[PDB]
Amino acid sequence: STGSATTTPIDSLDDAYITPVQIGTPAQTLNLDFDTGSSDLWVFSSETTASEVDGQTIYTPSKSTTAKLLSGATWSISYGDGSSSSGDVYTDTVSVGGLTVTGQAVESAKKVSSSFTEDSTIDGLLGLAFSTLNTVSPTQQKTFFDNAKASLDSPVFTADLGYHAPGTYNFGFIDTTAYTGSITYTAVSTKQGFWEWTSTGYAVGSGTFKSTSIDGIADTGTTLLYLPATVVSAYWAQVSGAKSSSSVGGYVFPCSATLPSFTFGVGSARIVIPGDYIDFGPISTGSSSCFGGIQSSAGIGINIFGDVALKAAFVVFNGATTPTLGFASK
Numbered sequence: 001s002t003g004s005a006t007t008t009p010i011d012s013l014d015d016a017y018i019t020p021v022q023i024g025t026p027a028q029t030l031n032l033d034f035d036t037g038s039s040d041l042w043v044f045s046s047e048t049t050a051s052e053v054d055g056q057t058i059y060t061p062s063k064s065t066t067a068k069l070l071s072g073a074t075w076s077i078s079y080g081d082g083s084s085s086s087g088d089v090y091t092d093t094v095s096v097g098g099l100t101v102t103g104q105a106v107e108s109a110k111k112v113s114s115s116f117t118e119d120s121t122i123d124g125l126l127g128l129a130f131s132t133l134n135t136v137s138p139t140q141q142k143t144f145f146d147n148a149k150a151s152l153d154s155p156v157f158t159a160d161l162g163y164h165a166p167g168t169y170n171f172g173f174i175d176t177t178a179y180t181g182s183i184t185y186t187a188v189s190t191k192q193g194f195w196e197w198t199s200t201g202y203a204v205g206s207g208t209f210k211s212t213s214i215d216g217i218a219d220t221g222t223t224l225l226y227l228p229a230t231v232v233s234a235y236w237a238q239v240s241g242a243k244s245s246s247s248v249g250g251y252v253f254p255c256s257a258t259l260p261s262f263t264f265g266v267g268s269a270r271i272v273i274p275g276d277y278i279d280f281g282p283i284s285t286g287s288s289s290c291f292g293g294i295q296s297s298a299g300i301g302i303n304i305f306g307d308v309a310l311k312a313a314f315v316v317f318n319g320a321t322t323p324t325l326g327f328a329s330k
Helices: 144-151 229-236
Strands: 003-009 017-023 028-035 041-043 068-078 084-096 099-112 124-127 156-160 167-171 184-187 196-204 210-218 225-227 243-245 250-254 262-266 269-273 279-282 289-292 294-296 303-305 314-318 324-328
Touching: 003 084, 028 041, 041 084, 068 099, 099 144, 184 196, 196 229, 210 225, 229 250, 229 294, 250 294
Parallel strands: 028 124, 041 099, 210 303, 225 294
Antiparallel strands: 003 017, 003 167, 017 028, 017 084, 041 124, 068 084, 084 099, 156 167, 156 314, 184 324, 196 210, 196 262, 225 303, 243 250, 250 289, 262 269, 279 289, 314 324
16 A cells, blocks of 8 residues: 655744644544654544644544544653643544554543644644654554554655645655655664664855764654754854854844755765755844754754755655665755
């Protein structure tokens, strides 16, 4: 089997991407944030504290003839950005782009943090990291991909995120029309539960390539590109007037600037992030200070190849017995 679904930016900055997901019988369609940095499929629901729901579409398990309470199971998650959610668990039928999994754990939120409430466009998350990170207790549950894997034509999914435009998540096949040149594959460590890999270096604009190993995670659920402070300083030094602002929480730059590109290495291959992908717009409405899309990972504890990086590529998440990651230009 295969599946193919369009993923759509939630706003004009590409702050996140939402993909429609069918849950239950009859189908209840929710728009979920596909997150290769976590491993829980959780949704706003009829059980979510009413004051914490503000415009989201909810899953109502009592209206699904295929929903079953997973007795005694609870979940609770905290994300790198400080947001969180928790609740109980149902199993139900879940379909993405025509690919159906029966008995998928659907984690129903009883509580969500303010950041989730305040974002009316995201109805929940669909985790695509390794199932070892799933938070369900006392019996850990599998991700949608893990459940689907054996049935897929090939045990892969691909992320093709757009810049200020829709893109695609495919399951079970590689669309050879969706990229240019070849896909370069690179090793993955699953030791921390992530799609963790090592970039071979970087360049700023038309500058020389610096060969240096940068360990990090391919994370569709993180907006920005978080890299070591040395790398980030080298980038922003090429933008007149850019500076790190402790008050704002990262590098800012004059909105009048033209940003240079940023290149990262995948083996001997190179992925070029155009400068415009690195512009996250005014820090507040009407400001002429703009927020940068490349930020320091210092104090995160891990480098993160978030959407800024991934949207410059066609990315293969290869879930073979020994997982690997592939990157192609597009």
